[PDB]
Design a protein around this ligand. Structure first.
Ligand SMILES: N[C@@H](CCC(=O)N[C@@H](CS)C(=O)O)C(=O)O
Ligand SMILES: CN(C)[C@@H](Cc1c[nH]cn1)C(=O)O
Ligand SMILES: [Ca+2]
Ligand SMILES: [Cl-]
Ligand SMILES: [Cl-]
Ligand SMILES: [Cl-]
Ligand SMILES: [Cl-]
Ligand SMILES: [Cl-]
Ligand SMILES: [Cl-]
Ligand SMILES: [Cl-]
Ligand SMILES: [Mg+2]
Ligand SMILES: [Mg+2]
Ligand SMILES: [Mg+2]
Ligand SMILES: [Mg+2]
Ligand SMILES: [Mg+2]
Ligand SMILES: [Mn+2]
Length: 428
C-alpha cells in the first residue's frame, strides 16, 4: 500500500529467492526430479515475470531485456517441467544479473508512480515470487543426497485433546471470497465477495496426524479398493502408492535430505488427493469442499461477519501460525491455540496445504487480473485436465501473501507439494 512497504515486500521475497539458490552452478542446473524445474529456471523466470508485469505492462509485444526467443524459455505453457533441464537456459550468473537489472528498474518505477496510483501488479508479483520460492523448496526436498539445508527452526509443542476431534460449523449464508477494497492484493480467483448458503457440517479441529495415517496403513488402507475412487485406485496401482512420500520402509522419513524418526503428532504431509479421500472414507468421514473450508476458516457465526484471519485481524506472528519457510516442517497438532478460527478449527493457516474436493472454478462475477492466464486455463473444463483446490497455506508460505480466501490447486496425482488432510462430515 505504502510504496515503502511494497519495496520492503519485494526485497524480502528476493532475499528468500537468493538464499534458495545460494549454491554452486552445477546444483542450480540439476534436475532433482522430472516433476521439477532446475532451480536456475525458476530464478530467471521470477525475473522475467517481474519484468513483464511491472515494466512491460503485461504486454509481451513490448521489448524486454532478453530476445523474445530467450524470454519464451521461461513460459511454462510452452515447456513441460521435465524438459527444462535440457533447454538452453541462462547461466546462474546471467540469471542473477538479469534479475538484478530488472529489480533496479522496478524500484525506480515504484518511486516514480503518481500519488494514489494503482499498485496491484506489484503485490501480484510479490505473491508470484513467494509461490516460486515454495516450488523451489519442493525441489530441494526431492533432491537425493547429503542435505543442503538444515533441519529447521524451533516450533511450539503440541497439546493433547485435539487430534481426531471435530468442530461444528452451523449452517446458513456466509460471504465467500473478497473484494479489492478489503484485500488490495487478492488474486483474481478470490473475487468477488458474494453470498453462498452452506448447510451445517463438521470439520476436523486439527489436520490428520502421522500416527493416525500409520493406522490407515496398518489396517490395509492401501490394499482395500473400497475406500478409493475409480481414478484414485487406478493411480494408486499405477504409481505403486503404499505410504506417504518420503516415508521409508524402516519407519523413518527423509526430509530435505535428513533421515529422521517420523513425529507421531505432526500433520501428515506429501499425500495425493486420492490418498486423502481414501483415508477420509476409511476413517468414516470425507474431504471438505473449499467453500466449507473457507467458511470454517473465516466466518464468525456469533457476529455474522468475516474475519481477516481465523483469529481476527491481527497480522500473523510466530505465536499464531507456522508460516514463512524457516521450520521446513509442519508443527505438532495443537501447537497454536491462539490461531483458532471462530468455530474452533486450529492451524487452518500455515503448516500444511489442505486438500479439498473442489475443482478450480470462477466465483460468479470473476474477472481476470492483468496476468489473465494465471487462473483461467485451469478452471474445470477449460482443457488443462483435472485439478483440485488446496487451502490454508503450508509452513513454506509467506504470511504476506496468504489469506483465508487464497486458492491453490494441483493435479490430484501430485504429492511432492507440502500437502496434508483435514477431515469433514455431514450433519443430519
Ligand atoms: N502444478 C502443475 C505445474 C503447474 C505449472 O506449470 N506452474 C508453472 C508456473 S510458472 C511452473 O512451471 O512453475 C504440475 O505439477 O503439473
Ligand atoms: C497457484 N499455483 C498452482 C501456481 C502459481 C503460479 C506461479 N506462476 C504461475 N502460477 C503454480 O504453481 O503453477
Ligand atoms: Ca493449512
Ligand atoms: Cl508462465
Ligand atoms: Cl535450519
Ligand atoms: Cl477481523
Ligand atoms: Cl524459504
Ligand atoms: Cl479439461
Ligand atoms: Cl491428474
Ligand atoms: Cl459425511
Ligand atoms: Mg511486510
Ligand atoms: Mg498425545
Ligand atoms: Mg463448538
Ligand atoms: Mg464486504
Ligand atoms: Mg489393528
Ligand atoms: Mn510463474
Amino acid at each position: 500500500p505504502h510504496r515503502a512497504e511494497l519495496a520492503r515486500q519485494l526485497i524480502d521475497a528476493r532475499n528468500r529467492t537468493l538464499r534458495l539458490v545460494d549454491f554452486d552452478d552445477a546444483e542450480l542446473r540439476r534436475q532433482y526430479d522430472p516433476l521439477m524445474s532446475p532451480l536456475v529456471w525458476d530464478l530467471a523466470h521470477i525475473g522475467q515475470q517481474e519484468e513483464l508485469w511491472l515494466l512491460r505492462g503485461g504486454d509481451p509485444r513490448r521489448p524486454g531485456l532478453l530476445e523474445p526467443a530467450v524470454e519464451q524459455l521461461y513460459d511454462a505453457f510452452v515447456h513441460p517441467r521435465a524438459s527444462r533441464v535440457h533447454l538452453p537456459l541462462l547461466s546462474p550468473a546471467q540469471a542473477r544479473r538479469f534479475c538484478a537489472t530488472v529489480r533496479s528498474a522496478v524500484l525506480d518505477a515504484l518511486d516514480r508512480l503518481p500519488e494514489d496510483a494503482d499498485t496491484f501488479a506489484f503485490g501480484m508479483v510479490v505473491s508470484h515470487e513467494h509461490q516460486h520460492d515454495e516450488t523451489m523448496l519442493q525441489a530441494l526436498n526431492l533432491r537425493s543426497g547429503e542435505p543442503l539445508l538444515g533441519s529447521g527452526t524451533a516450533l511450539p509443542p503440541g497439546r493433547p485433546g485435539v487430534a481426531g476431534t471435530s468442530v461444528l460449523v452451523p449452517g446458513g449464508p456466509f460471504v465467500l471470497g473478497v473484494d479489492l477494497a478489503d484485500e488490495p492484493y487478492a488474486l483474481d480467483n478470490e473475487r468477488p465477495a458474494h453470498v453462498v448458503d452452506v448447510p451445517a457440517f463438521r470439520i476436523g479441529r486439527v489436520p490428520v496426524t502421522n500416527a493416525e495415517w500409520r493406522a490407515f496403513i496398518d489396517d490395509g488402507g492401501y490394499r482395500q479398493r473400497r475406500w478409493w475412487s475409480d481414478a484414485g485406485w487406478a493411480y494408486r496401482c499405477e504409481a505403486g502408492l503404499t505410504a506417504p512420500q518420503f516415508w521409508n520402509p524402516d519407519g523413518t522419513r527423509t526430509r530435505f535430505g535428513h533421515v529422521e524418526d517420523i513425529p507421531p503428532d505432526e500433520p501428515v504431509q506429501h499425500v495425493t488427493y486420492f490418498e486423502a479421500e481414501a483415508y477420509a472414507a476409511w476413517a468414516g468421514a470425507r474431504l471438505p469442499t473449499e467453500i466449507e473450508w473457507e467458511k470454517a476458516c473465516a466466518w464468525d457465526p456469533a457476529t455474522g461477519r468475516r474475519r481477516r484471519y481465523p483469529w481476527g485481524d491481527a497480522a500473523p506472528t510466530a505465536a499464531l501460525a507456522n508460516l514463512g519457510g524457516d521450520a521446513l516442517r509442519p508443527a505438532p497438532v495443537g501447537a497454536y491455540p491462539a490461531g483458532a478460527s471462530a468455530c474452533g478449527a486450529e492451524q487452518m493457516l500455515g503448516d500444511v496445504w489442505e486438500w479439498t474436493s473442489s475443482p478450480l472454478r470462477p466465483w460468479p462475477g470473476f474477472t481476470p487480473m492483468i496476468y489473465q492466464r494465471y487462473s483461467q486455463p485451469f478452471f474445470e473444463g477449460a482443457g488443462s485436465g483435472d485439478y483440485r483446490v488446496l487451502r490454508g497455506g503450508s509452513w513454506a508460505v509467506a504470511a504476506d501473501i496468504l489469506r483465508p480466501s487464497f486458492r491453490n490447486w494441483d493435479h490430484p496425482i501430485r504429492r511432492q507439494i507440502f500437502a496434508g488432510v483435514r477431515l469433514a462430515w455431514d450433519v443430519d
